[PDB]
């Protein structure tokens, strides 16, 4: 049986995948497709790639000890996007909208 916090994490993630936020979430649904996009330097600048599908597998497979480890992976996904891409890029604008959704739910998660 998993903590009440880890259960709320599953609902936060689900909200991130909801149609409501799809217009900015969709680039984060799966691993960055480095071959298709032609990003030869990605795995050299980003040592720990992360996306919402990897986080969902890790969550459900009970690989997070707690909500804080779940949040560190969501934030690593955003950090990677902010590290790799120019500050004024649209994909960064999209990351920032999805991050706002996440930050707001993560903070309102009961103790
Ligand atoms: C679900 C994961 S995926 O399968 O890997 N899909 C996609 C992922 C991403 C993506 C790209 C990043 N960086 C690149 C670096 C090079 N310059 C462009 C941005 C990034 O950091 N993340 C997190 C996601 C862009 C995608 C698609 C599909 C289309 N596009 C882009 C490039 C695109 C291609 C063609 C037409 C329109 N848009 C795009 C660019 C900007 C915003 C959204 N998509």
Range of the domain at 107: 1-111
Instruction: Write the DSSP symbol of residue 18.
Output: S
Experimental approach was X-ray
- Beta carbons of 70 and 9 less than 8 angstroms apart: yes
Distance from the CA of 76 to the center of ligand 1, in angstroms?
Answer: 17
Breaks (C-N over 2.5 A) in the chain follow: none
Of the CA atoms within 13 Å of residue 10, those in its CB half-sphere come to: 12
CA distance 62 to 58: 6
Q: For residue 21, give the nearest of 100, 108, 110 by alpha carbon.
A: 100
Distance from the CA of 63 to the center of ligand 1, in angstroms?
Answer: 28
Provide the domain count of the chain. 1
Q: How far is CA 110 from CA 8, 49, 62, 105, 107, in A?
A: 9, 29, 20, 10, 8
CA distance 28 to 38: 17
19: Cβ–Cβ under 8 A, 6 or more apart, which residues? none
CA distance 35 to 45: 15
CA distance 54 to 70: 11
Whether 12 lines ligand 1, by a CB cut-off of 6 Å, is: no
């Amino acid at each position: 049986k998993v903590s009440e916090q880890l259960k709320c994490c599953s609902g936060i993630l689900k909200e991130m995948f909801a149609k409501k936020h799809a217009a900015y979430a969709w680039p984060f649904y799966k691993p960055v497709d480095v071959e298709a996009l032609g990003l030869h330097d990605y795995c050299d600048i980003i040592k720990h790639p992360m996306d919402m599908s990897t986080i969902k597998s890790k969550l459900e497979a009970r690989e997070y000890r707690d909500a804080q480890e779940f949040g560190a992976d969501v934030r690593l996904m955003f950090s990677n996007c902010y590290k790799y891409n120019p500050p004024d890029h649209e994909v960064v604008a999209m990351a920032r909208k999805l991050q706002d959704v996440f930050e707001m739910r993560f903070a309102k998660m009961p103790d």
